[PDB]
Amino acid sequence: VVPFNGKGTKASIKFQTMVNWLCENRVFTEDKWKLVDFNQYTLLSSSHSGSFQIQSALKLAIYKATNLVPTSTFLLHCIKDNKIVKLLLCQNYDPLLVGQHVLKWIDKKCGKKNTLWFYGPPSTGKTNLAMAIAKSVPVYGMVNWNNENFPFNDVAGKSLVVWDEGIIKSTIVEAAKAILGGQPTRVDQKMRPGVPVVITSNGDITFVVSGNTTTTVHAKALKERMVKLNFTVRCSPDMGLLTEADVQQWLTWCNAQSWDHYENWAINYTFDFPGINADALHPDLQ
Amino acid sequence: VVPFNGKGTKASIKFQTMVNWLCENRVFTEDKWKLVDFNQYTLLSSSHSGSFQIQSALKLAIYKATNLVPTSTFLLCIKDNKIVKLLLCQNYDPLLVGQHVLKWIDKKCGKKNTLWFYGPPSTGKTNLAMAIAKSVPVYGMVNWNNENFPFNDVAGKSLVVWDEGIIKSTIVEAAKAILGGQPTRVDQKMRGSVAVPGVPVVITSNGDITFVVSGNTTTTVHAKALKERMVKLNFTVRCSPDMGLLTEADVQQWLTWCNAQSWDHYENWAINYTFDFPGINADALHPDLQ
Amino acid sequence: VVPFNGKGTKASIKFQTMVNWLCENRVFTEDKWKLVDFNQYTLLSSSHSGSFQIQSALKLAIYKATNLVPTSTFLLHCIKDNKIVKLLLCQNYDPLLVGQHVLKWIDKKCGKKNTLWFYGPPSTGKTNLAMAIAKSVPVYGMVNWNNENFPFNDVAGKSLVVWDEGIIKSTIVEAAKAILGGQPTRVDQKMRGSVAVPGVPVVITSNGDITFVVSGNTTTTVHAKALKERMVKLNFTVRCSPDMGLLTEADVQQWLTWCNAQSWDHYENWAINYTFDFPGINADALHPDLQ
Amino acid sequence: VVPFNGKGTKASIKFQTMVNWLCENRVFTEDKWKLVDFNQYTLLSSSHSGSFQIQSALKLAIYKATNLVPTSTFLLHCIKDNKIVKLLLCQNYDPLLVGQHVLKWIDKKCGKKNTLWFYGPPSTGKTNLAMAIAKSVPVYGMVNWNNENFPFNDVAGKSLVVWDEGIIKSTIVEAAKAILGGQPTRVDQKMRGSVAVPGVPVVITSNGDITFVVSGNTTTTVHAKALKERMVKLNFTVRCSPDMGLLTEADVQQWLTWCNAQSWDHYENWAINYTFDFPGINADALHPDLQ
Amino acid sequence: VVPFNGKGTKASIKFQTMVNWLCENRVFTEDKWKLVDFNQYTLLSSSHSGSFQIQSALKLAIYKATNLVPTSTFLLHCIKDNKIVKLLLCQNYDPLLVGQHVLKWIDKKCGKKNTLWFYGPPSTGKTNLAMAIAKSVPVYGMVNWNNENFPFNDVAGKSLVVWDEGIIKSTIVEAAKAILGGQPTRVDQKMRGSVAVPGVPVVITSNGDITFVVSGNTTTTVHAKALKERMVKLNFTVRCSPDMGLLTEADVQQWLTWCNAQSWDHYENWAINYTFDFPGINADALHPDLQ
Amino acid sequence: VVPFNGKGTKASIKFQTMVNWLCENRVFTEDKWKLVDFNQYTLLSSSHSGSFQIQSALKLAIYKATNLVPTSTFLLHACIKDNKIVKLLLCQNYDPLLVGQHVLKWIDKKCGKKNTLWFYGPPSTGKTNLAMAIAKSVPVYGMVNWNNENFPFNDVAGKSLVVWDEGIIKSTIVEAAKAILGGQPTRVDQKMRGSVAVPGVPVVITSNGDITFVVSGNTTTTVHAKALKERMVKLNFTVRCSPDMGLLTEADVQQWLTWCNAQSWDHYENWAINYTFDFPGINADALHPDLQ
DNA sequence: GCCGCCGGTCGCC
DNA sequence: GGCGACCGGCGGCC
Ligand SMILES: Nc1ncnc2c1ncn2[C@@H]1O[C@H](COP(=O)(O)OP(=O)(O)NP(=O)(O)O)[C@@H](O)[C@H]1O
Ligand SMILES: Nc1ncnc2c1ncn2[C@@H]1O[C@H](COP(=O)(O)OP(=O)(O)NP(=O)(O)O)[C@@H](O)[C@H]1O
Ligand SMILES: Nc1ncnc2c1ncn2[C@@H]1O[C@H](COP(=O)(O)OP(=O)(O)NP(=O)(O)O)[C@@H](O)[C@H]1O
Ligand SMILES: Nc1ncnc2c1ncn2[C@@H]1O[C@H](COP(=O)(O)OP(=O)(O)NP(=O)(O)O)[C@@H](O)[C@H]1O
Ligand SMILES: Nc1ncnc2c1ncn2[C@@H]1O[C@H](COP(=O)(O)OP(=O)(O)NP(=O)(O)O)[C@@H](O)[C@H]1O
Ligand SMILES: Nc1ncnc2c1ncn2[C@@H]1O[C@H](COP(=O)(O)OP(=O)(O)NP(=O)(O)O)[C@@H](O)[C@H]1O
Ligand SMILES: [Mg+2]
Ligand SMILES: [Mg+2]
Ligand SMILES: [Mg+2]
């Protein structure tokens, strides 16, 4: 399709450059814009025609960073020295395979398996790793911030949805089957792609509370849409916060490795994530 | 009736050209506009006025594509077409089916405004319906609408799709009007006349929809009335588990070939419309498909 | 009343010319404007000013076509070969006397009797003649469109009100009497602001008697006296052959033009005291051409 | 005090002239403006600024004609030929005193006695006289048009209030005392930021005694003392000819103008202390123009 | 806190001059503006951008007159012929102390004794005196105008709150205690910046003791001690002449002009220990002009 | 981060200068602006354009004062024996050095979990006077008594200090109380502002009785007593004061905090390693000769 | 105050 | 006389 013949003025080209600048520096919120470049914000807020451009540029930047650009490219920029590499080795999970899956999972290339699940005892580092990814993607949203009876508001536009210490109520289970499966909401269909979801919890989430009693009616359907990871070993208190770079170096290194190994397991996506294969451990990871 | 003797400035001519450019490339949604041409959208959205124009152009393009141009214009060797292969296995005449579709999609079938596909599951009922629905500019599903108000925003659509639907006794009164091509009161009260918009309808189902659900029971009072407005097809043959997603290109090829052939056979059946679509006539098969 | 001494730029003259064109070409809805002239609509819809001018011009054209010009001028333009003339003769009715009645009724000059009633067996063409007149006037409103509990909405700014198969309920019989009698609605008395507001002609086609107002689950005849004061009745008893086809506004314009061309004293004799029932064909009084 | 030493631009002076012209020709509604001058109305409504100017100018003209200018100026321009003059002789009322009393009453000069009451048998012309006077003043409202539960809404901005065949209810008896006595509502107090501003003349017509306020399904005389002080009572005892016809503003203006030139000193002989019942004709008090 | 430089253009300078002219001639309401300078109001309403300036200027003028100017300056410009001086002597109170106290009171300088209370039999002129003071401040409000369940709304933006024929109920005792004592309401606290001060003076007229709180169908005295500390009580016992007439600004300002010129020693001696009652005439200290 | 290479007109530079001027003069409300400078306010409100500029300037100035500039810089300034606050602290048996130094960290949200100060003691001992003295120095603060009874924590965001005077905690709102008193932002704060974490507002509480006991109907419950103790710091005002010490002023606060900033921080670092619910009292020998 | 458009008039055909 | 493109004016925008 041939684009239109419209030629813009100086102001329009300046606005387009401003949108590119906002998209490049990951400035998607007013607070972030004030914290980063207060001078330009003060200059723009002087009048109506300046204030409107702020909202327009923010919306266009969000759309460009979410829909028109692959999210994985936002994450890609001594492999053994990375904290995350050691952490997955302790949990007997191959750092390479889990890294490759995240790239496909964030890129909606895993089919119906749109949801990741971290399972283990409390204080094993589940939320620390999960929250590290949420700070690496352009925009993220948490279920906890939403209303108690409307947990899935403002799902469209997010690069990732995080559900920390969550549990599924039978009154809203039908909505969970859609989003966790990646099916678009009916509102999205009417007005016009799914959003990856990550869930961390202490118990078994496949059990659904129904009244004052637990039930297993929906246990079968939720299993196909999810991948389970076991974080059993307690973490030392000195680990601290995981930096966005630690994710960046880990994902970038895993990207360049041979991909054919991941495709073999990708033929039949199992609900359970396979453990470390000692015969396939990379030499640099040792 | 003479067009007004006004003259357009250089600014309005650009808007008029953009309106034609919208219809030329079948872009009718803001998402499609963003996906196809981002630079022009970004340039337009940097000024109060620069926006009033996006919505105005979209509205004008929708109206022009839906009402001022025949729908079939958007649709217009043959043995290799998957659509023909589909209807061949289903014991129906591939040529005669398309010739009715063109008259049906153009609101030229009188009271029989509704088409119905029926059969066991995994027989291609839904795949064929979406292939037609993708080709038309604008289409809407009854599934997306509210349960208590299934017929909202029917106007402005070139087609309406109803997937695995069931008719309830509460909505049987509104269903009869929309399925029969009769204009709704909302359009009548707005437009000014008593008959204007026109909406084709296509329905798929695994069960007989002529039966109406009332309470926890099923009645047959409205069966005769719904039979007049509808046309039935029986997809009773299991399809080969190899066929893929039917595309608009497949439909356009099927309709283009069927359009130019002889139209002498169709109008004989058009004198009296049978409730069931006629099946394969062995002697009347076109020599191309023998 | 000397007009104002104001003056306006070329844009205002263009707007006035556009309003005059809308009045001339009989365009009164946005969809009609889109159908007749898409180019001018697309040019006008390029900015806020044009989109406001569209609504202003539409409203002004509607007002001019409704209140600034007598409705009869929108109807004027072998007489025996006219389909409508045959129909009234078949129904044993004089075409001239009916036509001359319409030209005074459509202009609200008949006073209290603002309503015509078409009554008789079904499928005799009662709706066909009623709708034919409606399609000729600038704009008409139908009671069937309006909501269940509020039938008399959107009456203002209309030329003709059509009500087919109508039944008067006791709940709304009081509001019904106002419009059917030519009395103005009370909201127009204040929104316009004095008792100078006019009313709208009403035409009713029914298969049964409408003087029997429905109350609950029982028929009552207390209101029959008041309704008969305001109404004129016709009887479509003789069913027509199913080959008359859809009547056209050209037939109405042709028939109405001929009626005004003849003598008017013939109708004036019956105008001294209007009768509820319409007198039938008189062989002596028939027009020389129609014989 | 000396007003602001401003300098009106070219456009603003046009607005001032338009506002003056609207007041001059008594054009107070959009529907009146369309009939009087459609040209200027279209030229103005050609754009947003013109519509805003129309909306502002209408309110300014209403304010100028209501508050800043006395109403009597629009009433003031042999006498035996006047219809109204003969009418009051039938009801044994002196036309001169009635004319003089109305002129002082319309401008809120009577103080407490702010209400005039017409009473008598039906068909004596009680409504005919009230309507003619009402349509002479620029803007008037009717209690009938207003909401049943809120009959005294939209009081401000009216030069006269007309109440036909009214009956006072116990639910609204308290609000009626203020309006009939010229007491402004709290809206005219707190939003107009004072204790009292308008005078809102009110006229009432009835066939029975309105001082008997209905209480539930019973009649009570508690409020008889309070209301009878606020009103002035006129009795239309004699039924007039059926062919009196509709009165017009021309008859109203001529009658008031003639009463203006006559002697005034006779009026205040009684006006120092009004009585509830209007005094009748005495042969001595009859002017020679009517003898 | 040196002012910003901000060199303004002629458009803003003219608006500032208009704002000053508003305060100078006491034009604080739209109705007063229309009644005083109609030409300027007509010119200003010719456009939307000109109509916005009226609402911009009125608020600033009201704020300037309320907070940026001492209220007593609006009061201060033979003596033995002033009606108030004569009236206060009839009640056996010293006019000089009353006038001196009022000026100190209106500027909120009495401390916690913010509210004045006038009590006595009817027809003693209590209400007439209260109106004269309220008519002289820029803007005044009433508790009578407010809603029954929320009588203490719209407190801000007023220089004096008048409560005529007042009485205190138990459902509003907590609100009345704060307002009568000068304590700012929580609205000012959450709109301005923490415990401010503006408050408002209050004047009360009553025919009965207001210290008796009405609860249910029983009179109670729980808050009698708390209320008395906040008011200064005056007993208006002597009936006044029926034909005294209303009081005006010229009477109050003339009276207040004399009082300010005298020494503050007489007042400041009693001001050290504020009493609930006000001292009467002392022949040992009556001013020579009033002897 | 390289700032966007745009350049503003004369009006934009003037507006930025006005925003700076509003910050420098501690003007944050319409009433304060009208009181300080009526002429500029009139000039701005003369037109529709300036009425929007006023609101934008105020909204930007509040944000600049609250989030961009540390609050403690508004306390420090650009006869120590005679300072009124020093005497008042000595009357109530507390070291003026440690009280001032702790404030400079509590007001800057640097104390970690212990985000609140608690004043306890009999009436008329000077609890209210000192509490309001700190508030008058910070740019903008909000007091709880203004809000609705059922909604106590409205408009908490965008304030430098939260004042709660003689208040008592109820079980119906004890769940929200542990949030602000703990320094973790409310749920709506993250959503409207994208980040799971945005620092909280310091809180100062005065009380005549022990607030660690929560009202539960017509009954006192102590289930939440433990949870409040690691969020709070307690000071006891056990000595009454004579009516010879009027309202405290910002001048006293600035002088007091200025001296506490210049002295060594070793006496604070010893206690700051492990915070205690009880604030240690006067040490007889540790008192520096500048206050002996 | 900002960026847009309609419009007049002089400049050139 | 006609066609051209230039700059200044004005728009509405809460
Ligand atoms: N705010 C923090 N500052 C420093 N270290 C932290 C912080 N939060 C967590 N950690 C460290 O991160 C590791 C685990 O963090 P945490 O988020 O509590 O893990 P978890 O297993 O997801 N916990 P839980 O929420 O109990 O399931 C430990 O080494 C902690 O010391
Ligand atoms: N992604 C796909 N979408 C549609 N059809 C598919 C797809 N993949 C394979 N097919 C095959 O294509 C044919 C179309 O089947 P489908 O249209 O889903 O059946 P149907 O009869 O309309 N189903 P039902 O919804 O039960 O009425 C079948 O043979 C499918 O097995
Ligand atoms: N599509 C049509 N359907 C029916 N009648 C038609 C049609 N087109 C033309 N006509 C003519 O219209 C005549 C009847 O018109 P119609 O208005 O339906 O009658 P009616 O007496 O008003 N009907 P009803 O509503 O049953 O009382 C027929 O006899 C035909 O001559
Ligand atoms: N066109 C006319 N309209 C009204 N009244 C007319 C007309 N022509 C003559 N009249 C007479 O003029 C008088 C007007 O009376 P009118 O004001 O309608 O009633 P009223 O005396 O107030 N009584 P009522 O309405 O019965 O309570 C009556 O005597 C009518 O007969
Ligand atoms: N029109 C008037 N306006 C004001 N004061 C008047 C007026 N006429 C007389 N007066 C004087 O005011 C006195 C009563 O006025 P008013 O202000 O109502 O007094 P009051 O003692 O406060 N009344 P009350 O409300 O009965 O307790 C009369 O006795 C006259 O001296
Ligand atoms: N504006 C003032 N007026 C009077 N006394 C004041 C004022 N400001 C301070 N004081 C005095 O300064 C001291 C401060 O006491 P304060 O801080 O109010 O004590 P408290 O125990 O918190 N009060 P309370 O509110 O009764 O619980 C007291 O002696 C007050 O009387
Ligand atoms: Mg956690
Ligand atoms: Mg299907
Ligand atoms: Mg009184």
Strands C231-235 and C115-119: parallel
Helix (H) or strand (E) holding B55: helix B48-67
CA→C1' distance for D49 and H10 (Å): 13
Nearest to D235 by CA among D280, D267, D282: D280
Tell me whether C31 touches chain B (CB under 8 Å). yes
- Burial of residue B166 (CB within 10 Å: 0-12, 13-18, 19+) is exposed
Nearest CA to the C1' of H11 belongs to which residue? C49
Tell me how far the alpha carbon of residue E88 lies from the centroid of ligand 5, in angstroms.
Answer: 15
- Please give the Cα distance from F208 to F117 (Å, whole number): 14
Closest CA relative to residue C15, chosen from A199, D44, E236, F219? D44
Distance C49 CA to H10 C1' (A): 14
Tell which phi-psi region holds residue E189, choosing left (phi > 0), alpha (psi between -120 and 50) or beta: alpha
Spatial contact of A66 and A155, defined as CB atoms under 8 Å apart? no
| Number of inter-chain CB pairs under 8 A, C vs D | 65
Calculate ∠ Cα D112-D118-D120, nearest 5°.
145
Task: Say which amino acid occupies F229.
Answer: K
Measure the CA angle with vertex C30, ends C29 and C35; round to 5°.
Answer: 100
**Could you identify the residue written with the tokens 């105020």?**
F58
Give the β-pairing of F214-215 and F220-221: antiparallel
Residue A169 pairs in a beta bridge with A209
In this structure, are residues E130 and E116 in contact, taking their beta carbons and an 8 Å threshold? no
Contact F39, E3 (CB under 8 A): yes
Amino acid at C213: V
Instruction: Mutation target for F interface from E5, E12, E68, E188: give the one with most F CBs within 10 A.
Output: E12
Long-range contacts, A218-223 (Cβ 8 Å, 24+): A218/A170, A218/A173, A218/A177, A221/A177, A222/A176, A222/A177, A222/A180, A223/A271
C-alpha dihedral (C204, C208, C210, C214), degrees to nearest 10: -130
Cβ neighbours of residue A223 closer than 8 Å, sequence gap 6 or more? A206, A271
Whole-angstrom Cα distance, residue E102 to residue F127?
Answer: 37
Chain C residues within an 8 Å CB radius of D18: 4, 6
Q: What is the DSSP letter of D169?
A: B
Please identify which residue in the block is written with the tokens 């002789």.
D89
**Helices A126-134 and A83-90: crossing angle, nearest 10°?**
140
Q: In terms of C-beta distances under 8 Å and separation of at least 24 residues, what long-range contacts does B120-125 make, across chains too?
A: B120/B206, B120/B235, B120/B236, B120/B238, B121/B206, B122/B238, B122/B239, B122/B241, B123/B90, B123/B235, B123/B236, B123/B237, B123/B238, B123/B239, B124/B86, B124/B90, B124/B235, B124/B239, B124/B243, B125/B204, B125/B205, B125/B235
Q: Is D203:D130 a contact under the CB 8 Å cutoff?
A: yes
> Which parts of chain C fold into alpha helices (H)?
10-25, 30-36, 38-44, 48-67, 83-90, 95-105, 126-136, 173-180, 186-191, 224-228, 249-261, 265-270
Neighbouring chains of B at 3+ CB pairs within 8 Å?
Answer: A, C
CB atoms within 10 A of CB E59: 14
CA of D57 to C1' of G9 (A): 36
Specify which residues B118 forms β-bridges with: B205, B234
- Helix D83-90 vs helix D95-106: crossing angle, to nearest 10: 110
Q: Is B42 exposed, middle or buried (0-12, 13-18, 19+ CB in 10 A)?
A: buried
The tokens 């107090």 sit on which residue? D189
List the single residue in E with minimal CA-CA distance to D184: E145
> Got the DSSP string for D26-73?
T--SHHHHHHH-HHHHHHHTTSHHHHHHHHHHHHHHHHIIIIIS-GGG
- For ligand 3, is residue C122 a contact (CB within 6 Å)? yes
Q: D122 C-alpha vs ligand 4 centroid, how far in Å?
A: 8
DSSP A69: S
Which residues make Cβ contacts (< 8 Å) with residue A190, sequence separation at least 6? B144, B145
Whether chain A has a CB inside 8 Å of the CB on F55: the answer is: no
d(CA D134, CA D143): 13
Token pair recorded at residue B254: 């099927």
The number of helix segments (H) and strand segments (E) in chain C equals: 12, 7
**Helix and strand element counts for chain B (H, E):** 12, 7
Reading the block at residue F139, the tokens are: 């740019």
Residues 113-172 of D with CB under 8 A from C: 135, 139-142, 144-146, 154
* Angstrom distance, B21 CA to G11 C1': 36
CA B189 distance to own-chain centroid: 24
Q: Is the CB of F12 under 7 A from strand G?
A: yes
Residue F128, burial from CB neighbour count under 10 angstroms (0-12, 13-18, 19+): middle
Closest ligand to Cα A120: 1
Map residue B206 onto helix, strand or coil.
Answer: coil
Task: Give the tokens for residue E254.
Answer: 């003339």
Cβ atoms of A122 and A227 within 8 Å: the answer is: no
Bridge partners for C204 per DSSP: C117, C163
Instruction: Label each residue of chain F as H, E or C.
Output: CCCCCCCCCHHHHHHHHHHHHHHHCCCCCHHHHHHHCHHHHHHHHCCHHHHHHHHHHHHHHHHHHHHHCCHHHHCCCCCHHHCHHHHHHHHCCCCHHHHHHHHHHHCCCCCCCCCEEEEECCCCCCHHHHHHHHHCCCCCEEEHHHCCCCCCCCCCCCCCEEEEECCCCECCCHHHHHHHCCCCCCHHHHHHCCCCCCCCCCEEEEECCCCCCEECCCCEECCCHHHHHCCCCEEECCCCCCCCCCCCCHHHHHHHHHHHHHCCCHHHHHHHCCCCCECCCCCCCCCCCCCC
The answer to whether C214 and C170 are in contact (CB under 8 A) is yes
Size of interface E-F (CB pairs under 8 A): 66
Nearest chain C residue to D35 by CA distance is C68
- Mark out the alpha helices in chain D (DSSP H runs): 10-24, 30-36, 38-44, 48-63, 83-90, 95-106, 126-136, 173-180, 186, 224-230, 249-261, 265-271
DSSP B145-167: S-SS-TTTT-TT-SEEEE-S---
Ligand 5 atom showing the smallest separation from residue E246 Cα = 4
- Ligand 2 touching residue B247 (CB < 6 A): no
Q: For chain E, what is the HEC assignment?
A: CCCCCCCCCHHHHHHHHHHHHHHHCCCCCHHHHHHHCHHHHHHHCCCHHHHHHHHHHHHHHHHHHHHCCCHHHHCCCCHHHCHHHHHHHHCCCCHHHHHHHHHHHHCCCCCCCCEEEEECCCCCCHHHHHHHHHHHCCCEEECCCCCCCCCCCCCCCCCEEEEECCCCEHHHHHHHHHHHCCCCCHHHHHHCCCCCCCCCCEEEEECCCCCCEEECCEEECCCHHHHHCCEEEEECCCCCCCCCCCCCHHHHHHHHHHHHCCCCHHHHHHHCCCCCECCCCCCCCCCHHHC
Cross-strand bridge partners of residue E202: E115, E161
Q: Does E164 appear as a known binding residue?
A: yes
Report the Cα–Cα distance between both ends of chain A, in Å, rounded: 51
Cβ-Cβ contacts under 8 Å, A189 against chain B: 141, 144
In degrees and rounded to multiples of 5, residue D144 shows phi and psi of -60, -40
Number of CB atoms found within 10 A of residue A86's CB: 13
Q: Which two tokens stand for residue C59?
A: 């409203």
- CA neighbours closer than 13 Å in the CB half-sphere of residue B104: 25
Method used to obtain the model: cryo-EM
Identity of the residue numbered D3 = P
Residue of chain A with shortest Cα separation from B11: A6
Phi, psi at E15, each rounded to 5°: -65, -40
Interval between CA A270 and ligand 8 midpoint (Å): 28
Residue with smallest Cα–C1' gap to H14: F48
Query: Residue E13: which of A26, F46, F85 has the closest Cα?
Result: F46
- Tokens in use for C20? 């005059």
* Helix B125-135, helix B82-89: angle, nearest 10: 150
Q: What is the largest CA-CA distance in chain C?
A: 66
Helix (H, G, I), strand (E, B) or coil at B188: helix
How far apart, in whole angstroms, are the C-alpha atoms of residue A90 and residue A92?
5
C252 in Cβ contact with C132 (< 8 Å): yes
How many angstroms is it from B127 CA to the middle of ligand 8? 8
